[PDB]
Amino acid sequence: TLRAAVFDLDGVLALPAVFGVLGRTEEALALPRGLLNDAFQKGGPEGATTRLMKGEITLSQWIPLMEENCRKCSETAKVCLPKNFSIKEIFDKAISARKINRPMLQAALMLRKKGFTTAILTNTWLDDRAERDGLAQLMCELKMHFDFLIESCQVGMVKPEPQIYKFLLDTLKASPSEVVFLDDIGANLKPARDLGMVTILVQDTDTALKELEKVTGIQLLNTPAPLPTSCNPSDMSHGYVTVKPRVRLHFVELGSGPAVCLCHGFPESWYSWRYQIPALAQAGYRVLAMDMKGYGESSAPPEIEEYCMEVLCKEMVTFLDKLGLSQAVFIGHDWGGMLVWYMALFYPERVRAVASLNTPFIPANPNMSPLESIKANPVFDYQLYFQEPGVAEAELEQNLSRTFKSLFRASDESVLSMHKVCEAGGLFVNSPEEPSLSRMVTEEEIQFYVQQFKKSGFRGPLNWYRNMERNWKWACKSLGRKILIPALMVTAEKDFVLVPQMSQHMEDWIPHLKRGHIEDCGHWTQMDKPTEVNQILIKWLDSDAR
Amino acid sequence: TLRAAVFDLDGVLALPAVFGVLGRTEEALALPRGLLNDAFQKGGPEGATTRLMKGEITLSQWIPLMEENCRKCSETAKVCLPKNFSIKEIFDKAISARKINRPMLQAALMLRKKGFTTAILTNTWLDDRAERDGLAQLMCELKMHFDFLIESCQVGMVKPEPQIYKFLLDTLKASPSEVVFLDDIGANLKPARDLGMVTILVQDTDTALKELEKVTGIQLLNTPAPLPTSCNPSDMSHGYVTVKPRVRLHFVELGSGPAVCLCHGFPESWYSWRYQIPALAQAGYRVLAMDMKGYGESSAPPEIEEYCMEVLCKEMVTFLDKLGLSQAVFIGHDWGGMLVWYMALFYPERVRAVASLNTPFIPANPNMSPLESIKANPVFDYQLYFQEPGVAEAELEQNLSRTFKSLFRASDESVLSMHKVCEAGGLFVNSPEEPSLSRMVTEEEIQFYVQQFKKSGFRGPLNWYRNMERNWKWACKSLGRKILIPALMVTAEKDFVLVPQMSQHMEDWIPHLKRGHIEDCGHWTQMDKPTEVNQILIKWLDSDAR
Numbered sequence A, B: 001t002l003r004a005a006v007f008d009l010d011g012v013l014a015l016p017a018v019f020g021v022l023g024r025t026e027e028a029l030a031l032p033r034g035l036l037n038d039a040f041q042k043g044g045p046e047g048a049t050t051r052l053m054k055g056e057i058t059l060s061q062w063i064p065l066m067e068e069n070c071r072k073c074s075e076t077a078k079v080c081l082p083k084n085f086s087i088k089e090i091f092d093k094a095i096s097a098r099k100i101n102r103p104m105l106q107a108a109l110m111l112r113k114k115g116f117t118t119a120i121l122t123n124t125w126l127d128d129r130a131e132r133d134g135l136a137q138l139m140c141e142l143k144m145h146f147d148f149l150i151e152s153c154q155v156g157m158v159k160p161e162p163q164i165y166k167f168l169l170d171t172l173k174a175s176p177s178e179v180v181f182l183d184d185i186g187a188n189l190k191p192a193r194d195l196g197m198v199t200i201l202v203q204d205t206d207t208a209l210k211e212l213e214k215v216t217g218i219q220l221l222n223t224p225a226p227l228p229t230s231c232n233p234s235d236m237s238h239g240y241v242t243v244k245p246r247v248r249l250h251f252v253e254l255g256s257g258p259a260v261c262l263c264h265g266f267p268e269s270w271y272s273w274r275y276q277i278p279a280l281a282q283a284g285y286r287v288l289a290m291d292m293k294g295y296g297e298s299s300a301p302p303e304i305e306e307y308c309m310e311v312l313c314k315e316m317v318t319f320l321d322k323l324g325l326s327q328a329v330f331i332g333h334d335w336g337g338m339l340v341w342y343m344a345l346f347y348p349e350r351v352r353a354v355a356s357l358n359t360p361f362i363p364a365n366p367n368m369s370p371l372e373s374i375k376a377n378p379v380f381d382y383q384l385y386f387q388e389p390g391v392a393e394a395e396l397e398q399n400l401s402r403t404f405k406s407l408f409r410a411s412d413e414s415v416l417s418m419h420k421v422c423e424a425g426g427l428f429v430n431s432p433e434e435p436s437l438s439r440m441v442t443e444e445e446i447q448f449y450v451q452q453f454k455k456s457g458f459r460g461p462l463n464w465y466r467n468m469e470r471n472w473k474w475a476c477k478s479l480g481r482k483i484l485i486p487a488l489m490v491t492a493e494k495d496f497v498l499v500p501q502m503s504q505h506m507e508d509w510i511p512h513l514k515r516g517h518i519e520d521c522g523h524w525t526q527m528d529k530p531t532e533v534n535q536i537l538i539k540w541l542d543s544d545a546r
């Protein structure tokens, strides 16, 4: 019975195979057939290429040896190499052109999802070329999805030597009959076959996957679109900054490039961005996913005034100051969306660009108290219930699992009416004791929120709602301003609290505003429609935030 | 008696004053004298500029109002504005040209060093221009050196209104006679004078500083070159990454730009880079200052094999993988210098560029055991003393303060002969019980090392020396390689263990090697000669690592 799948890199997980470029160059340069592939393999197990693949020498050391091999091969075949013939240029282009074979990676991901141990086994080199980063990036993206990466140049062994296969079985902690081995080179496939591993010769990806699903008994071809890569909290880099004596802010950090600060809503976590973090880092951004003040590993002081927008924003500026960041792109959802608009209004020099999911920017009405303004919208009744300190904390902290299961639901699964909450006397009074699990979340993901909320509870989070008057007076100081920095507003069709119509006047205060819209998407945007969120945010970042 | 100093930004802490550009433009464009400065102040306390300085409107909103004011002013003076007259272009250029007035900042730094409370009080705007980052960066560099930054646009008050001065005294928690106020505008100086603050009208920096030292009784002019900015551990962003089940790595993170990974030596800390961290971040780099395995907040497993170079390097690759970094520039000192050379040899695709302070790259001798190789150099006798598990730990852990005071000394202060250590029976047997404090360190800085070493002791750190045979066999696999990626070797004249002569053959294995050399510098390079270390590293990073 199979329980391990091994994939080659070249011609299997990555295409076009860097191998085929020697034949392509021959044909494009009208050189005798096989001339370059012959110079590439000159000396066999004793030649320059084997020394390279075993890690004896680096790629830059191999380049002049291959050039000398090309010369001897052309001499014997009675031909001439062209004037600006560069092995460096040929391979720079070939490596750069090689991209991940997405359907092959999707199959490896599915097999691992079904409890398979997956590995990459590859004949590769120590790359010290000026342009080595492209390949480093490719290897980084691929490897995170596998249990093991076995590189010939690191192990001092190459395919087809039989020792590398015994090394493979040893790392897999598996007998050969439990292993599928996928390779594009029949000669590299033979020793695995000789040992009794299931083997697949890969030419076209489609046929290889048909062979793979037949042999594993798992659907891999024509399968639905998978969810974006998520985060394992224990595998992340965790950052901590003290912004003032009693207040520290925790964040999760991934990627390189322009700093992107993700600001969650109520009652959430940095983890609400789990589907965005790998995708934005992959897009070329340095992601800083916050635990906002009052949440997770960030400090949660008990004082209401500690959660007014003026202080929350001041601390976010101090956070940038301590990290040595002159700016960050600020992306917020829900209450985090409200914060990001104030960052843009009060600290434009610190905000590279601003984006909000669901939360519209609405200027303060100087002729009405925020209490009157809340009363005007029946959907905002739960906000009045959240006012009295200790009341909502008691209900929300009673059964943590019930709280998150009841809140985190798609538009077609609702358990919660947020209208006539004060009248009913609670958020969950007409809600079941043991709610069903929403399609948007796993049981494990719910338990992560439960564990995060065990530290500080709901006091700090609820305190965000308890500064209406304070926030209103502060926001009135910005009434003569406009947001003129790059800005994106993303509306969610089925968010019944933060409705798309509520954002209709934004153009008056943000004239250059760009928009995104997600159909059949409820309040919990990031987990409801993660693929669409990632597409909208990356397109906007690349065009407007660099 | 004075105990607080307040500085203006424009014309005081930053020059050329953005004010003078209106007069400069008039003269360069042959426009009537004072025409632009007049349009800039049109309406006085009710005009566009005051609304801007109070934060009512942003800089991009003010631009068209100033352009309209320029038009009305030219109309009255019977003149014409030139064809491509742009207020935006004039101010973009002016703000960009404005740089920190270094002698003024040095004086503020000295006053604060002598226990003064320092503050910046400035009439400024909310900057939402496309090029706002330059100013954000300037404001970030300046502000970190002061107790307070009071910006007119954030407080809704401007100089010369008397409320801003009462606000200033309130934040300073000081009576006016305890305050020096430095301003380039006499009108903005008057209300401070009226209240009884000591005032200084700033024209040329030199005279202003003479007035400042006369009034404070502190030498500020012609004073020695100060040390680079250091780090306050509690003010830093602290990062944590799990690289394997029992091993986590801690680092301090500052700045944006290409990732720069600093690797300390024995028996050190991330804190050994305290003088490099602010300078490299200021130079445009993202600094990751490690606590190497076995040190500080990083994990310290007890097993010797956990500290061989192969595993230390593998974990550093995993560290990059978890942070989502395809590469980092690796800068090492001492044992960290040895590690960075192996990173370059075994993982070139992950190393953007490599630099070592003091530690030469010496290839393994395949015809001699590392034990024989150690025995060959009398200065390396202490290394044999470090071999037996528990022996050196006992001596080094007995009195932590004595350990660091005895080790951390300049070339002209030595207490330690590292020759005939085994014979003597210890490192400190001929060393005092209460060593004097080296000029390189404060008592507080010694106590930081003491506290760091209280967690794990010397077992993990000493284990770096206990893998000679393991390291030798691993390094022999790289004997056919060359380091062809960007590389810098920095020698220290007076390091008597890692002597400059020991690096003389490096060119044979690193043909493109660049060099730096520090005269009158002992083993503890970073704290011995920090100004020179910063100069060498920044020049090399900008030219070879981008």
Ligand SMILES: COc1ccc(C)cc1S(=O)(=O)NCC1(c2ccccc2)CCN(C(=O)NCc2ccc(C)cc2)CC1
Pocket: A265, A266, A267, A334, A335, A338, A359, A360, A362, A373, A374, A377, A380, A383, A407, A465, A468, A497, A498, A502, A523
């Ligand atoms: C413009 O300002 C205001 C104007 C009017 C009112 C009534 C309040 C404010 S406010 O500024 O006081 N509130 C911010 C808020 C907001 C409300 C309206 C507009 C902007 C921001 C954002 C967060 N939000 C919230 O409760 N999310 C949790 C949640 C949990 C579960 C589900 C299914 C949905 C939502 C609603 C309130």
Ligand SMILES: COc1ccc(C)cc1S(=O)(=O)NCC1(c2ccccc2)CCN(C(=O)NCc2ccc(C)cc2)CC1
Pocket: B265, B266, B267, B334, B335, B338, B359, B360, B362, B373, B374, B377, B380, B383, B407, B465, B468, B497, B498, B502, B523
């Ligand atoms: C080339 O490899 C080797 C070759 C020969 C030998 C004998 C050992 C090795 S080694 O690789 O085993 N040692 C690395 C080492 C190194 C030694 C020589 C060359 C490269 C690296 C770097 C760190 N260093 C050390 O003790 N610093 C602490 C310290 C504390 C206080 C002061 C005043 C000074 C130093 C010396 C040893």
